[PDB]
Amino acid sequence: PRLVLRALENMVRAAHTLAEIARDNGNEEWLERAARLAEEVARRAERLAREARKEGNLELALKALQILVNAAYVLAEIARDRGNEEELEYAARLAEEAARQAIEIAAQAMEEGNLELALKALQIIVNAAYVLAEIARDRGNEELLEKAASLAEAAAALAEAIAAILEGDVEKAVRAAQEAVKAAKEAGDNDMLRAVAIAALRIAKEAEKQGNVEVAVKAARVAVEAAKQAGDNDVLRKVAEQALRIAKEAEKQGNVEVAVKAARVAVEAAKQAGDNDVLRKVAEQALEIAKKAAEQGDVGVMQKAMDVALRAAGQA
Amino acid sequence: LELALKALQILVNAAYVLAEIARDRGNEELLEKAARLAEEAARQAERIARQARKEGNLELALKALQILVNAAYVLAEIARDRGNEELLEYAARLAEEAARQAIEIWAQAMEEGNQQLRTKAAHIILRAAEVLLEIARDRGNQELLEKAASLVDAVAALQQAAAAILEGDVEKAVRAAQEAVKAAKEAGDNDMLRAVAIAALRIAKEAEKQGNVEVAVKAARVAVEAAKQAGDNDVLRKVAEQALRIAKEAEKQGNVEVAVKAARVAVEAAKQAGDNDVLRKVADQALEIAKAALEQGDIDVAQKAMDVAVEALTQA
Amino acid sequence: PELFLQDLRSLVEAARILARLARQRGDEHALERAARWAEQAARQAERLARQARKEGNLELALKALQILVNAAYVLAEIARDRGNEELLEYAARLAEEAARQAIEIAAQAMEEGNFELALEALEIINEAARVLARIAHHRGNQELLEKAASLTHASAALSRAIAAILEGDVEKAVRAAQEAVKAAKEAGDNDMLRAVAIAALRIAKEAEKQGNVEVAVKAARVAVEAAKQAGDNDVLKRVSETLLSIAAEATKQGNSEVMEKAIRVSEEAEKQAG
Secondary structure, three states: OHHHHHHHHHHHHHHHHHHHHHHOOOOHHHHHHHHHHHHHHHHHHHHHHHHHHHHOOHHHHHHHHHHHHHHHHHHHHHHHHHOOHHHHHHHHHHHHHHHHHHHHHHHHHHHHOOHHHHHHHHHHHHHHHHHHHHHHHHHOOHHHHHHHHHHHHHHHHHHHHHHHHHHOOHHHHHHHHHHHHHHHHHHOOHHHHHHHHHHHHHHHHHHHHHOOHHHHHHHHHHHHHHHHHHOOHHHHHHHHHHHHHHHHHHHHOOOHHHHHHHHHHHHHHHHHHOOHHHHHHHHHHHHHHHHHHHHOOOHHHHHHHHHHHHHHHOOO | OHHHHHHHHHHHHHHHHHHHHHHHHOOHHHHHHHHHHHHHHHHHHHHHHHHHHHHOOHHHHHHHHHHHHHHHHHHHHHHHHHOOHHHHHHHHHHHHHHHHHHHHHHHHHHHHOOHHHHHHHHHHHHHHHHHHHHHHOOOOOHHHHHHHHHHHHHHHHHHHHHHHHHHOOHHHHHHHHHHHHHHHHHHOOOOHHHHHHHHHHHHHHHHHHHOOHHHHHHHHHHHHHHHHHHOOOOHHHHHHHHHHHHHHHHHHOOOHHHHHHHHHHHHHHHHHHOOHHHHHHHHHHHHHHHHHHHHOOOHHHHHHHHHHHHHHHOOO | OHHHHHHHHHHHHHHHHHHHHHHHOOOHHHHHHHHHHHHHHHHHHHHHHHHHHHHOOHHHHHHHHHHHHHHHHHHHHHHHHHOOHHHHHHHHHHHHHHHHHHHHHHHHHHHHOOHHHHHHHHHHHHHHHHHHHHHHHHHOOHHHHHHHHHHHHHHHHHHHHHHHHHHOOHHHHHHHHHHHHHHHHHHOOHHHHHHHHHHHHHHHHHHHHOOOHHHHHHHHHHHHHHHHHHOOHHHHHHHHHHHHHHHHHHHHOOOHHHHHHHHHHHHHHHHHHO
């Protein structure tokens, strides 16, 4: 493992120097050798990343992704001065595939609650995005600048939100996440939005410990904003389970108004998935919320609990 | 705080790139957002930086300094291209406040001998001064640049002196310190006089073991210069104890001339102090030094020693 | 002395920053002082590096070489503006020597098969060329650029060859060695060729360990090529011996033709050793 990564990295150093030295002279063969090396490094690194995905060492994987980013920088540095779009297209395809792989790593890390790996992966996304941004300006594709910008902004907004989880200001974390989903949505990549949704799941999973069910519902409102673009049923089911957990805690806290609103988000998500088992479990708990609102004597909240439970039942 | 620090360290990279993208687009809304985020990153980092002064983990503190010093780079880059002197001044004032905080690390690490902190703090000063350089680069405000110049010149000597304390060449240590005080005094070092001053006492402790009290007193002549420029207060209480130790050794060595120079320094300092008990202890020894000079038959030296005794005792 | 490198590097950074401010101020006395700050670090670091060879901690040694590389960068950064070639000549001779001493460290590490240290030493070799090349860009001799580039080119191939051995494909390693010897032919340094021959011996030992004696013959054939171009008799002995080891393994596999080839090449290596 270690040796191979170091050797690839230092081969990228060599290619970087070879291109640096060549541009002072106009040695075309030094550029040709460098380009071939960087391509072979990328090709080997892709295999390495796929194998590492099976081996389960996420750190070796994300280090290979940083190596791929550095190699993409060397490819771009040659290609943009050489004046060729095809080499930039290969680099863009490599970079987007790497971004997808990074999103999958980030999803696993953020589901597991390894914020360390999450931050690392997000920084990898920022660096990858920076290569895409430098490509996109000089190639002439403002939408590819939008992809790069949103990728970098969203990744760093998630990192900021992670810092805010660690400081404990879940509202400020949600404020950052709201801007994150907006930024991601402005380019429109569902795969990044899958990572964003899983970050919102992390926020919700931590908020269950704190007991601020109102801010937890706002985090779920971010979660569905992303998940309603991405449409993966298991992500939506995880969102629904968190929303029901939040609703159950709001019942125990006696905040039946927040419980009804938690159900209102729960059904919003569950309606996208159409899973009958979820929708019946949701509607059943929504009648438990209506029973608790009646036991608290909150007439209008019980009328709303009825309305939400009924709309939930109306999907299955 | 390991994660939250790591996130802040990451965050700057995206903010920078986002500014580059926004500047390439001419998108002022993104530049404004990036400026606000960059400022907020400092406003977050300040929390750890002021808290660590209570909690005593200087390694976390110098990481927070590294975060601030790195983070300032984005504010500078945005603000110079935007032509915004208010933000440039905000960044420069933030860097000065950070320098006020950085002395805490530098002095404490030098005094305790936890030099693994000192190396990082010195590099942090270098980066901070370089940040002042790149704030100032196109602006031409030499008045700010005097800070960068004097600090980095002082660091070069201070770093050499810090090595010389481990190496034991007290003449090399003084050859450095002679320049260090010149810069400090020309600038108005403020608290950085402390970071000059503590080195002379730390040198003297070993210089007693080396027996070259003459060079130790050459260092003490700097120590009182820095003290007297500063108003170093209770640090004089350390100074006087070491001066009395130096004098007692100079008596064992029979070097009543160097003993009298040491006393002449000691009274100069104690006259600023006004600590009456210290002045009593100084006057008590000043008679003994005159007595040693009488025992040597060095009556001009005994005269000077008793002139010092009177000059001290007359403050009572 | 773990602080010493950290502080040495701080002086290199301080001289660099002083020189920026000095260039805003047009100050040749500051450029003198900055050069002196850097030179004080460089002279002491040269002694440290030469000394560490005796002490045998190669990690600390190559970490000290990093000081020389970064110092040489700052010295070029001054001298290219300052218009003095003597300082560039000092820095160039120092850097060329530092690369040569790095190659000596690398040869020791690769003979032991400490590929970890080998990659770290090769990393210094890869970077040291960058500084030499930035100097040559100002001095105008394209020959220095060619040398520097070729120096990276050979060490890059060695880095790849290590990766192929760690992946376990000795034929990919032999292919990489065939690239490495061509890169060394472009470079024209006997000490780089010794590093190549030492690697080719270690590759041949791996191919024997796998029983792929045919690939071992290719590896040794490159080894003797490199050694024959370089003129190192003690390498040629070690190679000729190793080729009889290959002939013995080929005999264990019953392959009389590969055994005969291994003897013929062992005999060539002996004939060159004299």
